[PDB]
Amino acid sequence: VRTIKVFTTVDNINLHTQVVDMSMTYGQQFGPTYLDGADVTKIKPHNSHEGKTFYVLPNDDTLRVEAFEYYHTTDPSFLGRYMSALNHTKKWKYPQVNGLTSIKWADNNCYLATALLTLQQIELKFNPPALQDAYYRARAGEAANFCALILAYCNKTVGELGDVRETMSYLFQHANLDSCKRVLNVVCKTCGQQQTTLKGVEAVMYMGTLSYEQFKKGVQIPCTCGKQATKYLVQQESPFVMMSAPPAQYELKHGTFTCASEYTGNYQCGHYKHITSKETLYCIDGALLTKSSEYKGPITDVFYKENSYTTTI
Ligand SMILES: *CC(=O)N1CCC(CNc2nc(NC)nc(Nc3cccc4cnccc34)n2)CC1
Ligand SMILES: [Zn+2]
């Protein structure tokens, strides 16, 4: 019996010393086993593996507690999706573009890059520690684990076409938006005024218009009477708001928003690009960067910084 010493983990923080038999596979000794995302379940240990750290599935109480506190789940389906995704996103390149971490294009990841650039420009705290840790390193330039975790938490695989707003809505449900609140009024001339309150993710996202300013002044929506009603923002308490609308030509002005999602395509497929407002307007497309003092293009999401707003209507 020849052996080597290795470490197993589920969180990459608590390391557990193991002795492994070099005549058996990792699968025979640990169950499913991953080396930096690469599935080594069906391979035998090699001399170079001494002292290396391997991911295993939560198969005992120590590992179950560690995975539960780190990912907020012990389901072996999750860690497998995460490792499968990580085996690809560790080979993506993550260039700094206009001071933000982007992703060089690969595996249809334009939507992922647009969402990653967006997460770096809005105040947000994730509840699962795995998400918050990988978030910090994603800001620092090493976003392989963040992107793999996003794909895993949203039940998305590498290469699949994706939607930025669906992605953001998933990630928001894993963030601490408990304090967020929105109060809206809907006015009809022949029916009266109705107030509704929303909390959490619903207080932070709206579908139907891109302009925060128009949201505050009022938007027309069909009413129950068959006439047309006016809906407007009464009160907002959130670190940011996300206005979305079906892709359409929109004029973005410097200094009036935080960032935005460009979308050229149809309802099945399109190209996602990222507009950000710094000292001027910038468009980021993977590793590509252009600027313009004026912008008129197809926008589908606009992000605004917010703290507390109260109407004067
Ligand atoms: C930037 C990015 O990641 N991005 C833009 C290019 C597309 C191309 N890939 C792709 N994959 C699939 N899979 C089914 N389908 C399409 N469809 C498509 C592309 C372009 C035009 C039209 C027009 N009508 C229908 C479909 C398409 N494209 C990947 C995502
Ligand atoms: Zn009415």
Side-chain angles (χ1 to χ4, degrees), residues 1 3-4 6-35 37-41 43-58 60-68 70-122 124 126-177 179-188 191-212 214-223 225-226 228-293 295 297-313:
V1 171
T3 65
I4 60 164
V6 309
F7 302 93
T8 53
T9 194
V10 300
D11 58 17
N12 213 23
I13 294 167
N14 300 283
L15 314 186
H16 305 281
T17 301
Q18 312 293 339
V19 199
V20 316
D21 187 322
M22 306 192 70
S23 81
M24 301 192 277
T25 65
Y26 285 104
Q28 287 172 279
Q29 317 181 66
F30 300 149
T33 308
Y34 299 87
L35 181 58
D39 192 336
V40 299
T41 306
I43 80 158
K44 288 152 133 92
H46 187 267
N47 278 348
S48 57
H49 297 165
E50 250 274 3
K52 297 237 198 277
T53 300
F54 296 78
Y55 278 86
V56 296
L57 299 186
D60 57 47
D61 278 4
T62 298
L63 300 191
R64 279 188 186 99
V65 168
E66 278 156 9
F68 195 49
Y70 203 60
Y71 307 102
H72 289 183
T73 185
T74 66
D75 164 36
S77 276
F78 179 85
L79 259 180
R81 289 202 304 280
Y82 172 30
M83 292 294 109
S84 289
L86 182 74
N87 206 46
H88 302 276
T89 69
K90 77 203 205 109
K91 290 153 159 159
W92 297 353
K93 295 297 182 179
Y94 301 96
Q96 293 295 305
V97 195
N98 195 234
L100 302 154
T101 310
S102 199
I103 318 172
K104 183 156 189 279
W105 185 88
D107 311 324
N108 310 325
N109 68 357
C110 279
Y111 85 103
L112 219 36
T114 293
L116 171 59
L117 295 156
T118 300
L119 293 158
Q120 288 160 85
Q121 303 173 84
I122 58 176
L124 200 65
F126 289 107
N127 294 327
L131 218 30
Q132 189 69 9
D133 286 342
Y135 186 21
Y136 298 141
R137 299 309 297 163
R139 285 155 171 295
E142 304 170 0
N145 277 289
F146 198 40
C147 292
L149 283 178
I150 288 161
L151 282 144
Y153 277 107
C154 307
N155 195 35
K156 218 81 166 309
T157 67
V158 170
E160 241 184 27
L161 272 37
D163 185 290
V164 173
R165 197 191 50 75
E166 177 174 356
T167 296
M168 296 303 294
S169 177
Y170 254 114
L171 298 176
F172 286 171
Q173 279 142 240
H174 288 287
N176 193 338
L177 301 170
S179 267
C180 292
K181 181 217 238 186
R182 155 172 299 164
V183 181
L184 307 165
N185 278 350
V186 179
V187 184
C188 168
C191 301
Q193 196 167 233
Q194 181 152 58
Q195 188 157 106
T196 59
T197 294
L198 310 160
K199 314 246 262 189
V201 188
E202 284 176 72
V204 152
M205 302 171 70
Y206 178 82
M207 176 65 84
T209 173
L210 303 167
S211 167
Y212 201 25
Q214 215 41 56
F215 197 46
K216 292 167 174 160
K217 299 192 294 332
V219 288
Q220 307 292 112
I221 68 174
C223 188
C225 45
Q228 267 221 86
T230 288
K231 177 167 168 180
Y232 69 90
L233 184 64
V234 182
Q235 200 204 335
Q236 185 69 37
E237 263 143 25
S238 64
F240 65 89
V241 303
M242 175 189 190
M243 312 290 300
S244 300
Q249 170 163 298
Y250 193 73
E251 170 162 352
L252 288 172
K253 290 307 224 303
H254 168 244
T256 69
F257 69 107
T258 300
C259 55
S261 284
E262 190 189 77
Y263 183 86
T264 305
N266 55 42
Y267 63 97
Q268 303 185 161
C269 176
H271 188 161
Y272 269 117
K273 288 179 212 196
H274 187 87
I275 321 285
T276 182
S277 171
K278 309 291 193 64
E279 94 272 9
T280 190
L281 297 177
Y282 285 95
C283 181
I284 309 172
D285 184 18
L288 299 169
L289 181 60
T290 56
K291 86 179 39 171
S292 57
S293 280
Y295 178 90
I299 296 312
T300 198
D301 320 296
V302 190
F303 294 79
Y304 305 81
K305 202 176 172 284
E306 181 57 87
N307 174 68
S308 179
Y309 167 80
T310 306
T311 182
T312 70
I313 286 165

